[PDB]
Design a protein around this ligand. Structure first.
Ligand SMILES: C#Cc1c(F)ccc2cc(O)cc(-c3ncc4c(N5C[C@H]6CC[C@@H](C5)N6)nc(OC[C@@]56CCCN5C[C@H](F)C6)nc4c3F)c12
Ligand SMILES: Nc1nc2c(ncn2[C@@H]2O[C@H](COP(=O)(O)OP(=O)(O)O)[C@@H](O)[C@H]2O)c(=O)[nH]1
Ligand SMILES: [Mg+2]
Length: 168
């Protein structure tokens, strides 16, 4: 039923666009980059009604004790980079290690997301992202918030992952 998802990623990669697409089915062209906020979507995934509580983490860099305990209640994570930025791909490792830290676990459900797949300025290879996703034991998804491609499939896969982490 309830699954706390966290869309992590560097400023700009389209975490808020991928949030507002899953929740409202439209491309927002200007969501405040200083606004970090949570959003729930009741969707039915594979027979089971699921209240996905998605946190779009997007503000300033803080690491308070409050924020640890907060991201430790996050059960699953979308590591969101943009195909049109390399720093955004190199930041995916950083996000994964903050998750491994706050979760005290090597085995936390994650899904690599190569956002902005519609732009013709690919700087991050699909092989790279598959290589980075195969080293983590996580699925890799290429998405487009502008065109919703892979959006559902991304968040849905993450919950399928979280489903598989619970039967373990
Ligand atoms: C996330 C998360 C995160 C998790 F998944 C899990 C647990 C966490 C527990 C924390 O206590 C705290 C976090 C946490 N919260 C906010 C961060 C952040 N703010 C700044 C901007 C860019 C995103 C958004 C959010 N707005 N930015 C960067 O890291 C980016 C880089 C780029 C410049 C320097 N830093 C150091 C690294 F090299 C990479 N990390 C952040 C971070 F860990 C956590
Ligand atoms: N073309 C395209 N632009 C995107 C996509 N996702 C986000 N953007 C753009 O990237 C900019 C910043 O994205 P935002 O959602 O603010 O990312 P955040 O700062 O990581 O939350 C926005 O102006 C969006 O128009 C996408 O899939 N395709
Ligand atoms: Mg944002």
């Amino acid at each position: 039923t309830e699954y706390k998802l966290v869309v992590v990623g560097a400023d700009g990669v389209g975490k808020s666009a991928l949030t507002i697409q899953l929740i409202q089915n439209h491309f927002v062209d200007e969501y405040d980059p200083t606004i970090e906020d949570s959003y729930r979507k009741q969707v039915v995934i594979d027979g089971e009604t699921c209240l996905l509580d998605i946190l779009d983490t997007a503000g300033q860099e803080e690491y308070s004790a409050m924020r640890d305990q907060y991201m430790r209640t996050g059960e699953g994570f979308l590591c969101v980079f943009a195909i049109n930025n390399t720093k955004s791909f190199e930041d995916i490792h950083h996000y994964r290690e903050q998750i491994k830290r706050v979760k005290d676990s090597e085995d936390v459900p994650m899904v690599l997301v190569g956002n902005k797949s519609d732009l013709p300025s690919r700087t991050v290879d699909t092989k790279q992202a598959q290589d980075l996703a195969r080293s983590y034991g996580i699925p890799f998804i290429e998405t487009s918030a502008k065109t919703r491609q892979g959006v559902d499939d991304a968040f849905y896969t993450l919950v399928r992952e979280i489903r598989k982490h619970k039967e373990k």
